[PDB]
Design an enzyme around this catalytic site. Structure first.
Site: not given
Ligand code: UQH
Length: 763
Positions: A536, A733
């Site tokens: 990212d 992660e």
């Molecule tokens: O593994 C996939 C990708 C990789 O492909 C990439 O290479 C890598 O850079 C990132 N990862 C992850 C990217 C996901 C983006 C979307 C996340 N949004 C999200 C985060 C949290 C959350 C809560 C607590 C702490 N932190 N976060 C909660 C929600 C909720 C339902 C309510 C959504």
């Protein structure tokens, strides 16, 4: 074709709803789906806050996940719920037979933990829905006046499933009894069923549907003079009036006092006799045995992780990864404008592309389906493209046929141009978990082609009934080849798509290099991000520029050609294989000519200056190692040797906990959101570990340096994830290189699970 049908039949059913704690659906878009809910009830207003359904992770939940799992056979999930004072087990098992993908059974067991009041009241619901125009499902009414003393039987039929019965058994445990007046009209307390219908597309909204029923119950109390002068007990206020019938939604509700358990028995009519509980118990016992025997063979952990503690750990990390597998179905949100701004050919392109996005021409299209594993049950339970490349590496070990299904599923999304969206948000259910601003997919946005790594593994295996099915694509060389035959054209399509859409600019600048053709630039970068690369906020040239070249992207193209050489060969695509060979040879040269920094001792991204000349921009970290990580460098390469020094160097990348994403010497180390700017990520450490081992087990000048680094890095990575798991119950992660702490997201299984393969070794 024969293997195909046996695979279909085998994988049809499962607990393929990883976005909820426990539910089932088959791999059909519009069909029968089930889901579990539970919550303590202590007051007139608490249940709405205590009830559990969709996965989350907060202070009220100790932890949860699969102890054992195999999508062909079933498994056991453990749920440790602090809010509701409950330790739950959900056992699921599949029973092959008939013509409709077989039968299944599940046992729901709840044990109050030591902190919970021994007389706790827990509401349990089993919610069953069925989508489709010509399908039927009906609850057989009870004999008793106000609900069921014993089992609840639903009879249904559809084209996909034929005839079936679904039974929710009486179960064990104290069922509370109300002495209130209300019990004259509502019964003293018993299992109840409500059978309802809603338009198909909302059936997934289980919680609102249930609550609307609960609320109508309360309105009836109010209307019928049940009031605060003399109120029925909470659990009775929240117990639905029994109303079985036919419909596309059936709510089966129970209340238990103390510990409880109950069975769900799905019996495919086309199969033999129906499923019993005694069947469930046997099939569960048998599943465990088989799980045990397979794990020991497929994931034989090597020194110094041979011990039982590491075994349990490996079983947890593996089972959570393969247990994440879901089936998703529905429309996706896509901008098909192909606005010219997306070409990003000007300086300052990010502002142009933002303008285009602000036109909001995206629309729903599909429906699509996808059978995939996922990174995160609580936070993002859906397909991510380069993640899946890593997920399938241990999955393929376990069941190559499974991995190939998932690969095939992914490739069937590819559009006519060669594009697969990097992030698959399929249907209104998946969308619910995602803000509108982040749903839209962009046809010009790539992601690393890591699925080729899995293909590379299958290829090596190809060259050198649940047991049989797992490996039929390798044990029948002709099966394997046909699979490759049919996929090959899509792989080629994707290759060409990369070269059309993610082309860098050599010819237009003061730029010299062996090839005029080979140079790449990820589309979609902003001032601070490059989401498409997967890394990212890893630092890139500033400002972003149509002249940028990205060494990671070119390395992925390297990965792709090499795969295409091997697959081309096996299919005798002679003309193709000659073209690839010339592409490979040019990438090899151009990586050096355009990306190697002799001054810095590593690869670097490139831009062009204020003065229109090619400048290297070096930020020592994962990016810098890319040709090594992607297997592209000769084992006697002096360049490789210099990267080995960078990798092992404690003041740069080497922490006691694994390789840091960015060097401590880099100006951007630990800045901003610090996502890919210092933490240890397992996916990239895994590629390092595999490449180090390759050099370690081959004659060359770096054999012994590689052997040492391999030994230590494997140790460091495995021990870091193990210690964090031991302490917290979670895979994380990413890991902090100063403290070794897991940070960011929990339940990341997720490529962190690669640690199973690292421990098992013998690459
Ligand atoms: O593994 C996939 C990708 C990789 O492909 C990439 O290479 C890598 O850079 C990132 N990862 C992850 C990217 C996901 C983006 C979307 C996340 N949004 C999200 C985060 C949290 C959350 C809560 C607590 C702490 N932190 N976060 C909660 C929600 C909720 C339902 C309510 C959504």
């Amino acid at each position: 074709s024969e293997i195909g049908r046996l695979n279909n039949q085998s994988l049809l059913w499962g607990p393929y709803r990883p976005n909820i704690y426990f539910g089932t659906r088959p791999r059909i878009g519009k069909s029968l789906m089930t889901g579990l809910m539970w919550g303590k009830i202590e007051s007139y207003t608490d249940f709405q806050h205590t009830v559990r359904y969709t996965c989350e992770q907060n202070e009220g939940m100790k932890g949860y996940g699969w102890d054992e799992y195999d999508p062909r056979r079933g498994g056991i999930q453990s749920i440790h719920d602090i809010q509701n004072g409950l330790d739950i087990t959900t056992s699921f098992v599949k029973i092959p037979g008939g013509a409709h993908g077989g039968s299944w059974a599940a046992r729901i067991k709840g044990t109050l933990n030591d902190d919970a009041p021994k007389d706790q009241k827990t509401i349990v619901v089993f919610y069953v829905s069925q989508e489709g125009e010509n399908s039927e499902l009906e609850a057989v009414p009870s004999e008793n006046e106000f609900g069921y003393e014993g089992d609840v039987i639903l009879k249904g039929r559809s084209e996909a499933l034929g005839n079936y019965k679904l039974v929710v058994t009486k179960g064990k445990g104290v069922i509370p009894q109300s002495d209130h007046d209300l019990s004259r009209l509502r019964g003293p307390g018993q299992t109840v069923v409500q059978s309802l219908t809603y338009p198909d597309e909302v059936l997934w909204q289980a919680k609102p549907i249930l609550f609307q029923q609960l609320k109508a119950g309360i309105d009836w109390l109010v209307e019928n003079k049940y009031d605060v002068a003399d109120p029925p007990p909470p659990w009775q206020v929240y117990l639905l009036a029994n109303k079985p019938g036919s419909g596309n939604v059936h709510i089966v509700q129970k209340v238990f006092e103390g510990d409880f358990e109950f069975d769900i028995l799905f019996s495919s009519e086309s199969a033999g006799k129906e499923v019993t509980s005694k069947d469930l118990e046997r099939e569960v016992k048998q599943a465990t045995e088989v799980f045990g025997e397979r794990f020991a063979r497929v994931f034989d952990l090597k020194a110094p992780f041979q011990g039982d503690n590491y075994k349990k750990f490996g079983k947890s990390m593996f089972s959570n990864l393969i247990g994440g597998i879901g089936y998703f179905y529905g429309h996706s949100l896509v901008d098909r404008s192909y606005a010219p701004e997306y070409d990003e050919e000007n300086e300052g392109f990010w502002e142009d592309a933002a303008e285009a996005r602000a036109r909001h021409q995206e629309a729903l299209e599909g429906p699509y389906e996808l059978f995939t594993s996922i990174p995160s049950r609580p936070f993002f339970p859906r397909g991510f493209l380069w993640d899946e490349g890593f997920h399938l590496l241990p999955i393929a070990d376990w069941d190559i046929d499974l991995a190939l299904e998932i690969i095939k599923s992914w490739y069937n999304l590819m559009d006519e141009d060669g594009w697969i969206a990097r992030e698959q948000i399929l249907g209104a259910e998946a969308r619910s978990k995602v803000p509108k601003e982040f749903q839209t997919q962009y046809p010009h946005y790539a992601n690393p082609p890591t699925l080729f790594l899995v293909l590379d593994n299958f290829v090596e295996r190809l060259r050198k009934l649940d047991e049989t099915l797992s490996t039929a694509s390798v044990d029948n060389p002709e099966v394997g080849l046909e699979y490759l035959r049919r996929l090959y054209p899509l792989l080629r399509r994707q290759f060409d798509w990369f070269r059309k859409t993610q082309a860098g600019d050599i010819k237009s600048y003061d730029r010299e290099a062996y090839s005029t053709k080979e140079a790449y630039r990820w589309r979609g970068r902003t001032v601070s991000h490059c989401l498409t690369s997967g890394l990212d906020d890893y630092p890139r040239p500033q400002p972003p520029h149509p002249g940028e070249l990205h060494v990671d992207l070119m390395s992925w193209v390297g990965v792709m050609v090499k795969s295409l050489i091997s697959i081309g060969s096996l299919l005798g695509a002679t003309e193709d294989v000659e073209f690839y060979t010339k592409v490979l040879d040019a990438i090899e040269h151009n990586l050096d000519d355009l990306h190697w920094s002799e001054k810095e001792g590593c690869y670097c991204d490139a831009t062009i200056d204020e003065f229109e000349e090619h400048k290297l921009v070096c930020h020592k970290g994962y990016i810098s190692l890319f040709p090594f990580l992607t297997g592209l460098l000769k084992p006697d390469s002096p360049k490789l040797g210099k990267l080995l020094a960078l990798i092992g160097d404690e003041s740069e990348l080497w922490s006691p906990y694994g390789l840091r994403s960015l060097s401590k010497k880099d100006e951007f180390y630990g800045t901003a959101e610090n996502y890919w700017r210092s933490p240890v990520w397992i996916n990239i450490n895994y590629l390092a570990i595999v490449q180090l081992y390759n050099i370690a087990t081959q004659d060359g000048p770096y054999k012994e340096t590689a052997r040492d680094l391999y030994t230590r890095l494997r140790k460091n990575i495995v021990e870091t994830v193990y210690r964090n798991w031991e302490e917290t119950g979670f895979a994380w992660e990413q890991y902090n290189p100063e403290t070794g702490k897991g940070q960011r997201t929990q339940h990341f299984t997720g490529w962190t699970s690669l640690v199973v393969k690292i421990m098992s070794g013998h690459h």
